Paper text:
In mammals, the canonical Hippo pathway contains a core kinase cascade, formed by STE20-like MST1/2 kinases, Large Tumor Suppressor LATS1/2 kinases, the WW-domain containing scaffold protein Salvador (SAV1) and the adaptor protein MOB1. MST1 and MST2 can each form a constitutive homodimer through the SARAH domain, and kinase activation is achieved by trans-autophosphorylation of the activation loop (T183 for MST1 and T180 for MST2). In this study, using a combination of biochemical, structural, and cell biological experiments, we establish the PP2A complex, STRIPAKSLMAP, as a key negative regulator of Hippo signaling in human cells, and show that SAV1 promotes MST1/2 activation through antagonizing the STRIPAKSLMAP PP2A phosphatase activity.
To understand how SLAMP FHA recognized phospho-MST2, we obtained crystals of SLMAP FHA bound to the pT378-MST2371-401 peptide (pMST2 hereafter for simplicity) that diffracted to 1.55 Å resolution. We determined the structure of SLMAP FHA–pMST2 by molecular replacement using apo-SLMAP FHA as the search model. In the SLMAP FHA–pMST2 structure, the FHA domain adopts a conformation virtually identical to that of free SLMAP FHA with an RMSD of 0.33 Å for all atoms, indicating that binding of pMST2 does not appreciably alter the conformation of the FHA domain. Only six residues of pMST2 (D376GpTMKR381) have clear electron density, and bind to a surface formed by residues from the β3-β4, β4-β5, β6-β7, and β10-β11 loops of SLMAP FHA. M379 inserts into an adjacent hydrophobic pocket on SLMAP. R381 makes hydrophobic and electrostatic interactions with side chains from V107 and V109, and main chain from D108 of SLMAP, respectively, indicating that a positively charged residue is preferred at this position. G377 forms a 90˚ turn to allow D376 to make favorite contacts with R53 of SLMAP.
Numbering used by the authors:
A (entry chain A): 2 to 135
B (entry chain C): 376 to 381
The structure:
Amino acid sequence: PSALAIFTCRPNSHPFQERHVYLDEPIKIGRSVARCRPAQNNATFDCKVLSRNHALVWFDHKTGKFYLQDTKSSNGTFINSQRLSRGSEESPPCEILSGDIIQFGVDVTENTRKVTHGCIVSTIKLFLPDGMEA
Amino acid sequence: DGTMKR
């Protein structure tokens, strides 16, 4: 069986529907574009402050740990409020545990239209292949 | 590309 990540939306997030993402292979977190649209079983979001290739999430069988990696995002990735890498820089793999608060992007105000676009803020639940919560 | 940037 595959490891499983569940992304649930937090109150200060741009709204999204709960995601059930199986981690048979590493999963790209990123912004919706006609080639990839949001689905209940992916980590693609219709959120303008997310990068196209924002981050990667995967399960490592050797360590038994789950990892998140920022892949040169413009606006940042955060675990429990701690940023993974500077803008346009790649982070190392950073361990995530069930219950962690993961943020993709930051709020951005579009100055000419004076509309604030929220970021994605998620509680993540993580399950080992054997079903045990991480 | 195309990201709304702070």
